[PDB]
Design a protein around this nucleic acid. Structure first.
Ligand SMILES: Nc1ncnc2c1ncn2[C@@H]1O[C@H](COP(=O)(O)OP(=O)(O)OP(O)(O)=S)[C@@H](O)[C@H]1O
Ligand SMILES: Nc1ncnc2c1ncn2[C@@H]1O[C@H](COP(=O)(O)OP(=O)(O)OP(O)(O)=S)[C@@H](O)[C@H]1O
Lengths: 328, 109, 55, 109
DNA sequence: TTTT
DNA sequence: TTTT
DNA sequence: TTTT
DNA sequence: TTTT
């Protein structure tokens, strides 16, 4: 009876193990991780939105939004964190726009990085496939997916009707690469622009580019929107960035987060940590007068940020409790 | 119905993936032996565990090639030991001929 | 037997979003009449919103 | 005198000649004026008032997609010229809005 | 892609 | 893939 | 297998 | 034996 079924099941599993190896069955204790390994983005608001405190490993992630929304430099913070981990990462850009001086201002070591200038999209795909399987690379960044063009359209003249061609090939590409991506636990992000399609007055007028199966394969998708910018005195110095979670498999969606992005320096970490500390009750504020532990740290974001940057230990202690009380 | 092919299609990110998990949980309630294979290789065992399905009493699969997914599915169905068989993202399945081919080669149909 | 699944709407409690309304329409069957579409809510984490449909 | 003129009757020919010259790599600065004045040949073949909305954008996006790699290769200088069209329902934000699709500003450094 |  |  |  |  039941013993017969168990014996047959064991025989089948043994045959699978013989033909294929350990891949038949998960390890009953080793396959179970209490926490999913991930890579933090350098902004705890985004991490807590992710519900795992970092970008999941081995899973496709996509970002789309209006043009010139700082998504490009948003990727660089992830690059810097990967370099901090020592993880080998490479960057490929289809639009062929990159300012290594700009990225260096962001603190990312451009030297420990592999660049790519793929003239054709097919070569971008071939090199991405080759590197992912190398398993040596750990974070893989492709920018401006829409800028990618099939070679068939290149060989064609201007204005020829090659509609519905990039989608099939990109679908094939993800189909080929997702297994390897899982194998190496590598980090692959995608960048899309926004195209408002015909007859879209119902639902959301905005629509992503790059076919449709992308979002199906992507385990997590984030929307980025430019709402406002911070102006100090007369000149403008940074742009306020609003990112809203639009799809996830490990965390509840629609966990939108607010944060400021300052040019050159990058992420305005002090402001967000201050805001969440004061709103959660960790940091007391008598109305509009900022304070901490009954001490007049200062009034205004700049004074508190200066007070916090000189003492990284205090900031580290302050952020340590936040993730523990929120993420876990 | 038992012993009959059933198919589900719809727009991306429509919760079809987690829709299957309710069926998995009911099969586990029946005690029926079930296994899950995913061609897109996307699965959150924490997410499924939140759905109440016992992930432990389940056989996972991470088929690098579609042909291996098919061979393992055939082997298990004939084992007759498994009772519910789940394959996700059929479109994500790719013939090995296209894998051996370069990017953009015409392997239509 | 073939079933179509379509995302029509989602349920929002207060400000945050907590679940998605799922519309599934029968498109082919051999044992039952087709086009017997059904309405039901899907709540994240917990799963199927059984109480609502039974009510 | 030390300058090459062009009088492209159709926008497609303007694009083809621009692509040919950029790849020549001989030219060093490339100037195209009145991008909005560029018209797809499909609209030329069509009559007056026919609805060909959302056509120039796709082709110009394709054009930049093709040409940006060569532009990087030759370190050439490419400028674009746009007029201003105030779009519907723009009372919030900046009423002014550029022409020539949207991906232009994405590609423009 | 304004309009009085 | 917008457009005035 | 969409696309502006 | 379709495919976007
Ligand atoms: N070298 C730089 N010097 C000063 N500000 C910069 C520099 N590079 C980028 N920024 C600013 O950073 C913000 C976003 O720019 P980036 O992240 O570098 O590029 P990006 O706009 O994200 O890429 P896109 O949107 O796909 S064109 C904007 O506010 C820019 O003004
Ligand atoms: N771990 C999770 N935490 C919170 N919500 C989740 C989680 N996993 C899934 N969901 C939600 O469940 C709904 C459908 O997701 P899933 O069923 O898990 O995956 P799926 O979207 O069905 O698979 P696809 O559509 O082929 S990508 C969405 O509303 C998700 O936000």
């Amino acid at each position: 009876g039941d013993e017969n079924k168990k014996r047959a099941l064991a025989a089948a599993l043994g045959q699978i193990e013989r033909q294929f190896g350990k891949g038949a069955v998960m390890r009953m204790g080793d396959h179970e991780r209490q926490a999913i390994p991930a890579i933090s983005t350098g902004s705890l608001g985004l991490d807590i939105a992710l519900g795992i405190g970092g970008l999941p490993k081995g899973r496709i992630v996509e970002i789309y939004g209006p043009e010139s929304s700082g998504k490009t430099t948003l990727t660089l913070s992830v690059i810097a964190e990967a370099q901090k981990q020592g993880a080998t990462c490479a960057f490929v850009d289809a639009e062929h726009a990159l300012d290594p001086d700009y990225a260096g201002k962001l603190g990312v070591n451009v030297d420990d990085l592999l660049v790519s200038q793929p003239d054709t999209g097919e070569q971008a795909l071939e090199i991405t496939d080759m590197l992912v399987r190398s398993n040596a690379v750990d974070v893989i960044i492709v920018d401006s997916v829409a800028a990618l063009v099939p070679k068939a359209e290149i060989e064609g003249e201007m204005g020829d009707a090659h509609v519905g061609l990039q989608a099939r090939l990109m679908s094939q590409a993800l189909r080929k690469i997702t297994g390897n991506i899982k194998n190496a636990n590598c980090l692959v992000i995608f960048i899309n622009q926004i195209r408002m399609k015909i007859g879209v007055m119902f639902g959301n007028p905005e629509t992503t580019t790059g076919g449709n199966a992308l979002k199906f394969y992507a385990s997590v998708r984030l929307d980025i929107r430019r709402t406002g910018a911070v102006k100090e005195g007369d000149e403008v110095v940074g742009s306020e960035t609003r990112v809203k979670v639009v799809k996830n498999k490990v965390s509840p969606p629609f966990r939108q987060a607010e944060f400021q992005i300052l040019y050159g320096k990058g992420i305005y970490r002090t402001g967000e940590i201050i805001d969440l500390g004061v709103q959660l009750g960790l940091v007391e504020k008598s109305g509009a007068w900022y304070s901490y532990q009954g001490s007049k740290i200062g009034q205004g974001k700049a004074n508190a940020a200066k007070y916090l940057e000189d003492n990284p230990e205090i900031g580290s202690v302050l952020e340590k409790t936040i993730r523990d009380q929120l993420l876990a």
